[PDB]
Amino acid sequence: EPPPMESPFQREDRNPDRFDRDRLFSVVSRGVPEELTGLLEYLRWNSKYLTDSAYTEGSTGKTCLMKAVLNLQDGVNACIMPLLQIDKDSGNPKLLVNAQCTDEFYQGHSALHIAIEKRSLQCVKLLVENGADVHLRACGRFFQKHQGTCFYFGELPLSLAACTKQWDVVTYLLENPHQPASLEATDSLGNTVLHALVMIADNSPENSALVIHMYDGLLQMGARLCPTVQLEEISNHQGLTPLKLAAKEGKIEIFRHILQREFSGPYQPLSRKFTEWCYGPVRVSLYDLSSVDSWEKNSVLEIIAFHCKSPNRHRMVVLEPLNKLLQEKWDRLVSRFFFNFACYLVYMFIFTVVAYHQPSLFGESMLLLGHILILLGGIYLLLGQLWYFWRRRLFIWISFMDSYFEILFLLQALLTVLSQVLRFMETEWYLPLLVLSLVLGWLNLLYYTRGFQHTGIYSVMIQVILRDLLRFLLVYLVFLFGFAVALVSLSREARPYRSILDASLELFKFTIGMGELAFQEQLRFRGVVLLLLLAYVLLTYVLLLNMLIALMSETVNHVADNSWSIWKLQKAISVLEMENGYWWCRRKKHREGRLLKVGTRPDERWCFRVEEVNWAAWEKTLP
Amino acid sequence: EPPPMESPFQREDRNPDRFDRDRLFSVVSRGVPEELTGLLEYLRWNSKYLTDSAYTEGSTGKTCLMKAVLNLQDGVNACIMPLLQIDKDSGNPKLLVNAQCTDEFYQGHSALHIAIEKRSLQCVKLLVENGADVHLRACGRFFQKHQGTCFYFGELPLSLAACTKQWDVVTYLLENPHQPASLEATDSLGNTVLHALVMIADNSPENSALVIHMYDGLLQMGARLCPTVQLEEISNHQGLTPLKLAAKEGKIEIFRHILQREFSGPYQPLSRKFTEWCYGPVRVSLYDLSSVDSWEKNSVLEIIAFHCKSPNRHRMVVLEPLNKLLQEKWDRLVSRFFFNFACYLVYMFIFTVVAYHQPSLFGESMLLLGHILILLGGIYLLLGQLWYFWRRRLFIWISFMDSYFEILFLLQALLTVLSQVLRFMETEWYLPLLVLSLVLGWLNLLYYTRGFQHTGIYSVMIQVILRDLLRFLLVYLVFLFGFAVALVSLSREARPYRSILDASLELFKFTIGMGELAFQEQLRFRGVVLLLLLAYVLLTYVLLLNMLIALMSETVNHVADNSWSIWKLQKAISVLEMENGYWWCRRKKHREGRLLKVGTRPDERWCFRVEEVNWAAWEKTLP
Ligand SMILES: CCCCCCCCCC(=O)OC[C@H](COP(=O)([O-])OCCN)OC(=O)CCCCCCCCC
Ligand SMILES: CCCCCCCCCC(=O)OC[C@H](COP(=O)([O-])OCCN)OC(=O)CCCCCCCCC
Ligand SMILES: NCCOB(c1ccccc1)c1ccccc1
Ligand SMILES: NCCOB(c1ccccc1)c1ccccc1
């Protein structure tokens, strides 16, 4: 285990009048500069420096200056200025101010990080004025984002200040003469203070207000400080911009704010929403499509559909501009959606005919042509599904609850092709596969219920249970096998249940409401056999009643309004897929919106126009 | 797509020192009148006028004055007075102030509409003083009432002011010397400012308070301004008065207010409720029956029962006066309701006897007389239902959930007459129709459960499910046919399910709790047949459990108090129908209430007396 960062109780580990580490750590933690007065002479005589291993905590590299800054009284410690002076007077080739922790838990942590976290502006000035490097990165495992004891803030001093909500510190780090911070500076993950603010977001009303106020403030500060730099166009090492990371992470509160952002006055160029005209309850705005429109690779639309794993995903697609943008893409695409459904219906009708009236193991030529059409249709679907899974490869397995139709379309195509292979091999097992393929092909027809709102919102309200059906079956099949062996073993002796599979299927019938209690008067232990069947029935009815109740509690503890939101996400995934066109013929992707000058920095952007009517909001504005 | 009404970003389309449109639109949008100083000379030299196509936006006809009024700074634009002066000085045969948009989206929109919407009283005065026509109608598709981007306010300047809650503007438009507005003036739909206020209503607490305050204020203003005009007696082009339109539209908050309206002092003639005497918790009021009592065609009672499609309909019939009026009409009618039920019981008893003991394909004469009575009874019911559907023709298909008994009474009569026709033709299919008619005739008996409160409120709480029964059957019958073809196809091969209909009916039994899992040891693929039946059962139980849960969520998310309200609406529909009498004998409709002088304008009205006891309200009035 790593040592505590500071402790009143446990001493730091080991792993002319004398001035050892424990003497030094005692004076600086008490804060009494007059007791430091032998130290320069001792160091000089020995040729030792305060950076040396003998003066650190052995396991971390934590120095006397870090010890001093961990121990502040009313934001001050009178040792810091003398101790820094002694380092300068010593002639150390390294600088004490820039010393860092070397432990795998606290790696790169420095006195400046501690000063900022202790909220002492005086110490921040005092360190920066004495040559503190404002770009050292606290990159150790305590500082990385994961489960358990950690605090991610980015890794830089400016990013800590921002995430700790210290505006005085942030402005001093940016504006100071000695070593000004950079808004462009980046951590070991490529995250810039704007990315760090997106990562610390939690979608809570308070955290959101802090994050939004610190994000906007820094963006305004950047407009003054570094006017030639687009701070929101800088990408992580995963090639995400702060808006794209807010989408990936599912930080809906900050995502909404960035996407909708509007300012008047000198900061207008920092807007993404530009209000165009109002009339009564009608508001028309232009929205900036930059990095949002599916025209370009790795957009927020593709990230929300494919790369995000947040439960928030459906809530994100119903925000403007995305809600109107996706509606326009759907209105353009919907003819191709019903054409695809028509082709699938024709294929499934030909499949149904070819399955239904087929000989036992002109009309023969029509049956052969029918087999050929379903073989070709099965190959075509197989290729299309293989291309889908290959195109998704970097983010497969994100959401089975959105993906499962793509697996079942693959499965139906595989069994169709395999059945037609076995039919060419003339082997009787082809008929089972063709019939099982017909069954999946009819069930797969439910995919298209998303293409109509009436059937799309009903299907989404329902399609709740298929996750619970497994948990039931797995638990129950364990009861089933135990009672099945017990029945077979007990039925061997004469004065039914002949095999484990036979007995399991009888016990299954008793579960699904098809049971048959009677005295089995053929066999010796008929009373004990009846006891087992009674016990099995009662335990099964308990387990079913438990399942029903568990499920019903999650029905009372539910909100109906998600149904429309989840249906919009299904249409979004459909739109984004079919905007590519088919595996055998790529689509020309045209850009949405139009290119307009929104001001001067010439600030020209692809803007999408959105018209919103809001009687409630407008009436609140009246006298 | 139509252009934006105004844009900072997109220039208006095209489709002596020079003074083109872009020079002109630039000066007036900036608001700098000194830059306008060449324009008169240029226009004069060319013989051009500011109304001409060259100076408009080409696609809309939007003029420089509309551009000027779209761009107000602190409610002003210093260009307007110079620009109007230049139009007068030009000698234009048209007047710039009265220029209007010609686009199909903004048709008839004018500078005065924009000024009012921008809430600039100064511009309204400045336009009216320079000859603005206060009766131009904004009738384009943006201004009509429909789905998507629009704002209906009526179409007139006075109606916009009222719906935008501008009392200063409303009074100035009414009272000014130059061109006074008319409270009687009417839009392209016949709607007068009072109708427009009913159309903008939404039944929300805030919208209702605005609408009510603007309606009452205008009605008081009309009493002063145009004393000889009954503003509430003016009809739409659909022949509806503002009260009747509030009923049709289902605007229950404004409907209640108009219906119940009471004033003391100089405005007393504007009342519809007149308080008569109070004693402790007892209040007696007269209510004005004008346009409310079913005596006259197209009353609010007939509109609520027949012509309204709002979910609010049941809430509207329980307001006074209507609640006591309908109770008095029911108390008068109820003998005829039970007489009709007695005749239907006698017919259904004779039908039951004649169906039950009938020969295979004196007592014979009694059976023939029984057939004649049910033929005549079936003809009589057929005619009565045909007359009902013809009388309803303008508003059939409003509410199947209120109408369905009128369809099922028609259906039973058709099958009865047709069965007796086939019985005269001596063909064996008559017995199925007579028996199917008997079944419907017994189910139709449930209609009369509304005639008693004990059975009327119980039936209404229940009769929830019949809409969900279809959605279940349709989805489920698609699973059924897919598995049915699959079973038939798989059962053809020997070592049950012989036909698609046979297999479908077996799979139906498995759904309704009558299933039969067994190894079908007669046929080759018995294991795969059992796999299909297991899969079918499990998918069916998932689909049933989904339906049960969906339905149960709409049971927790429900309010029981609607039951009594919906039963009153059923009695209202019954009352209004039977007040006509029968298809073979029209009823004399007597008027309700009595003719009383409620004041002097002699203000004599048909008043209905209502007595209400309200301990709770009265006790709040005590010290
Ligand atoms: C109207 C007459 C049709 C005759 C039958 C043709 C074979 C159809 C095979 C089939 O079922 O295709 C369905 C497919 C839509 O797939 P999807 O995107 O919904 O699947 C995934 C949904 N979850 O449809 C398409 O991709 C478009 C149809 C084929 C275009 C021509 C192909 C030419 C190839 C050289
Ligand atoms: C007491 C002895 C009765 C002997 C049987 C007479 C035939 C009755 C046929 C029948 O079922 O009539 C029901 C009908 C009421 O209909 P409704 O308004 O409830 O239907 C719609 C409800 N949803 O009832 C009536 O309209 C009134 C009864 C008939 C009056 C005499 C007719 C003379 C014609 C020249
Ligand atoms: N034939 C299309 C009917 O649409 B509906 C529908 C039918 C089956 C599955 C899903 C939706 C519908 C939904 C609610 C009430 C009434 C009908
Ligand atoms: N015979 C008339 C009984 O009325 B009740 C009634 C019976 C059947 C259908 C509807 C209502 C009733 C209602 C609630 C509690 C008890 C009885």
Numbering used by the authors:
A (entry chain A), B (entry chain B): 31 to 45, 72 to 417, 429 to 530, 532 to 563, 589 to 694, 699 to 720
Manuscript text:
Therefore, we used a high concentration of RR to ensure saturation. The strong extra density at the TRPV22APB+RR SF was clearly visible from early stages of data processing before application of any symmetry and is aligned along the central symmetry axis; the size and shape of this density is consistent with the expected dimensions for RR and density consistent with 2-APB is present at our previously proposed 2-APB binding site and not in the vanilloid pocket. The SF of TRPV22APB+RR has adapted to accommodate RR, with tight coordination by the backbone carbonyl of Gly606 along the interior of the SF and the lower gate is closed at Met645. The primary site for RR stabilization in TRPV22APB+RR is the carbonyl of Gly606, which at distances of 3.0–3.2 Å can form hydrogen bonds with ammonia groups coordinated to the central and bottom ruthenium atoms. The only significant conformational difference between TRPV22APB+RR and TRPV22APB_AC is at the pore, where a downward rotation (9°) and shift (1.1 Å) of the pore helix to accommodate RR leads to subtle shifts in S5 and S6 which constrict the lower gate at Met645. Our TRPV22APB+RR structure revealed that binding of RR to the 2-ABP-activated TRPV2 stabilized the channel in an intermediate conformation, preventing ion flow through the occluded SF and closing the lower gate at Met645, but at the same time inhibiting the transition to the inactivated state. This TRPV2 locked in an activated conformation allowed us to resolve clear density for 2-APB in our previously proposed 2-APB binding site, but not in the vanilloid pocket, a recently suggested alternate 2-APB site in mouse TRPV2.
Transient receptor potential vanilloid (TRPV) channels are a group of six polymodal cation channels subdivided into two subgroups by their sequence identity and functional properties. TRPV1–TRPV4 comprise the first subgroup of non-selective Ca2+ channels, TRPV5 and TRPV6 constitute the second subgroup of Ca2+ selective channels. Here we use cryo-electron microscopy to reveal the molecular details of RR block in TRPV2 and TRPV5, members of the two TRPV subfamilies.
